[PDB]
Amino acid sequence: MLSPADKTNVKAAWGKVGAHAGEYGAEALERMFLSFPTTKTYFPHFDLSHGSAQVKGHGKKVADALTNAVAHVDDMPNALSALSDLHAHKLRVDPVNFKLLSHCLLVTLAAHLPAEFTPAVHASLDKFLASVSTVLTSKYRGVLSPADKTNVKAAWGKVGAHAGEYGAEALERMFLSFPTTKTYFPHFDLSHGSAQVKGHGKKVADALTNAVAHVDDMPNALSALSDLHAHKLRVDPVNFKLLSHCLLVTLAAHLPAEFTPAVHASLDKFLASVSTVLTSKYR
Amino acid sequence: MHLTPEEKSAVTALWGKVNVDEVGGEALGRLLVVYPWTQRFFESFGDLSTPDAVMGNPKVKAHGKKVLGAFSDGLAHLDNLKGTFATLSELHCDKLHVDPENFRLLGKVLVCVLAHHFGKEFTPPVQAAYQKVVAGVANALAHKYH
Amino acid sequence: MHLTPEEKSAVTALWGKVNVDEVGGEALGRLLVVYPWTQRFFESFGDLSTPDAVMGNPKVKAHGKKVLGAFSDGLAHLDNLKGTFATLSELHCDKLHVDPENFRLLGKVLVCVLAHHFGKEFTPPVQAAYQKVVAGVANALAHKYH
Ligand code: HEM
Ligand code: HEM
Ligand code: HEM
Ligand code: HEM
Ligand SMILES: [C-]#N
Ligand SMILES: [C-]#N
Ligand SMILES: [C-]#N
Ligand SMILES: [C-]#N
């Protein structure tokens, strides 16, 4: 993830911020509340008026956390554990808002470090902030509990030799429903019932069968598959939630009595995990 | 929004078989059972521990129908959901404080219900016309935010 | 997108102090340096191995004036971004094969560049006006995808 060169660029830039960390934090928050108002729903109790006293306070606490992160850059997850339980478990903040804050943090830094905001430093800072987010967004809906393990098997098993058949139907439902995904298969004949989609559809379900078989160690199992997507192709992460929704609709259209709320929830948790495995190497 | 006469006839066609009531609670209960955190908004109901607690809880059902109703209403004014969901959009922002990014979870849960209760009938081209409809409704609900 | 008149007035006022040839080159150098995977689309530009090379690369600079030239147009026709970015939408979809999720990456880098050049003058309200602009531009440019 972060390279030694990256660590160095961070430490230096944050070093230059210095005693202003406190005020830059209140500014990033204000900019955010102003550019992305939907974020305000997480602070219904605060006084978000300009120059507010409550905002000056939280900004400093947010700043102290980045200093903690910058100071323990080698073990981010450790030093930020409590901060993670809070945003994930207590607060329940959707991961998409971390991208909005980080953004307003970089904008603040850029406007205050004229000489320092080089493209190289801009790049190293954007990765750090993305790491901090991943860490505070880690322990959300996670872990395949033993009950899910059963569900995924008690359901995938009930697919059988109709796996390649369903994986092809998942792909078509995605291409039709979400047209932008075709930007990854431009040379294919994405037409209904094509041999490309069918020949490809069986591979997806074969890798999914394998993921179920190795449900407790997908990270090893899918290693070369994650390299393909995250590195050789660079598929945008959000696309994976599209392929996942479509597999659920297909699965649910073919195995109804078996698609109970309990079964549903577990397949959603499994597919969410598969996606993350193929995601990882992206940054 | 932009619906082709064909998909503006396919959507309404299949909805004419939708039991808004039972489907209203099938969708809402799953939201509560599939994306647990959303439960912090509905304690007003009661016991939401087990999926059996959820689907059986009568508050969830009762509310689920009030929701699939506004949805049906949005379907009568398919090309102006901003005006039909304006009030509700003010309610969810000011009173309820819901990050609009949740509106999308109900969208994918409802579609799955349509797939479950129609299987074969809920063909790929139908799904598509539906994806468009829920997205249009989500953007209407998130419209009055500020 | 809906910007107020004073927001419209602020955006344009500031755009006037902008040196398109200068900012366009830097906005694009940053995209390729900060989101290095997007350079997969610019293999023909030459050497893009070091940040020093990217920013100094002649093709990168030339392409940026074009990019920001399109932008000033979008700003010059703010009440119709779709009719201005239609050719461009069709091109990025059909000819180039760009996932529209990458559009937001460019807008992000533009805001950071404007902030870097304007510093203090790039106030929060002024950033908000601009956030509306780039979200509108990316939306119009992602319209002819099919
Ligand atoms: C780079 C990511 C972030 C960092 C480093 C961060 C840091 C912090 C810190 C240090 C606190 C103080 C917690 C305490 O004193 O117990 C906190 C609280 C909180 N954060 Fe974050 N946070 C981040 C992103 C977010 C986002 C994106 C949201 C939602 C927009 C959010 C919402 C909140 C809320 C609602 C509180 C508590 C407010 C209260 O005291 O009632 N945080 N955060
Ligand atoms: C549920 C997650 C997914 C799984 C398990 C999966 C699995 C696979 C597998 C097994 C291959 C075949 C490897 C090969 O021999 O080329 C592959 C290739 C590929 N995947 Fe995925 N994939 C998933 C999601 C996605 C998504 C969402 C996209 C983009 C819409 C994507 C785009 C591609 C492309 C473009 C290729 C290469 C096709 C080619 O060889 O021309 N994948 N995928
Ligand atoms: C996206 C589709 C949605 C629509 C159209 C919708 C519709 C409704 C309707 C019609 C009501 C009843 C309001 C009345 O009394 O007149 C309501 C209430 C409510 N909605 Fe939504 N809603 C949606 C999504 C959500 C989501 C995703 C959440 C939160 C995760 C949410 C949370 C609430 C809450 C907390 C209430 C209050 C119920 C109570 O009194 O306890 N809604 N909604
Ligand atoms: C954010 C809005 C965007 C605008 C305003 C924009 C604008 C433009 C313009 C003006 C051209 C025309 C060049 C010509 O016809 O001679 C172009 C070409 C192109 N754009 Fe974009 N673009 C956008 C986003 C993207 C993004 C994010 C990518 C993907 C990383 C991208 C990749 C390309 C490529 C590779 C070309 C072809 C360049 C060539 O001729 O080699 N664009 N774009
Ligand atoms: C953090 N707010
Ligand atoms: C890969 N689909
Ligand atoms: C209302 N859900
Ligand atoms: C486009 N650059």
UniProtKB/Swiss-Prot annotation, chain A:
Record PTM N6-succinyllysine, positions in chain: K149, K153, K158, K182
Result when mutating H229N: In Auckland; unstable
Effect in UniProt of substituting E169V: In Spanish town
Sites bearing Phosphoserine, chain numbering: S145, S177, S191, S244, S266, S273, S280
Keyword vocabulary terms for this entry: Acetylation, Disease variant, Glycation, Glycoprotein, Heme, Hereditary hemolytic anemia, Iron, Metal-binding, Oxygen transport, Phosphoprotein, Transport
Family matches, as CDD domains: Hb-alpha-like
Similarity remark: Belongs to the globin family.
Protein name: Hemoglobin subunit alpha
Source organism (scientific name): Homo sapiens (Human)
Curated annotation (Swiss-Prot), chains B, C:
Effect of P124Q: In Ty Gard; O(2) affinity up
Stated consequence of mutating G16D: In J-Baltimore/J-Trinidad/J-Ireland/J-Georgia/N-New Haven
Effect listed in the UniProt record for changing H143R: In Abruzzo; O(2) affinity up
Outcome following mutation: C112F: In Canterbury
One Gene Ontology term of the molecular function aspect: hemoglobin binding
Recorded coiled-coil stretches: none
Consequence the record notes for mutating H146D: In Hiroshima; O(2) affinity up
InterPro entries: Globin (IPR000971), Globin-like_sf (IPR009050), Globin/Proto (IPR012292), Hemoglobin_b (IPR002337), Hemoglobin_oxygen_transport (IPR050056)
Result, substituting L75R: In Pasadena; O(2) affinity up; unstable
Effect of D73Y: In Vancouver; O(2) affinity down
UniProt effect for mutating S44C: In Mississippi
Effect of K132N: In Yamagata; O(2) affinity down
Keywords: Acetylation, Congenital dyserythropoietic anemia, Disease variant, Glycation, Glycoprotein, Heme, Hereditary hemolytic anemia, Hypotensive agent, Iron, Metal-binding, Oxygen transport, Phosphoprotein, Pyruvate, S-nitrosylation, Transport, Vasoactive
Effect of H92D: In J-Altgelds Gardens; unstable
Effect of V109M: In San Diego; O(2) affinity up
Protein's name in the database: Hemoglobin subunit beta
Species for this entry: Homo sapiens
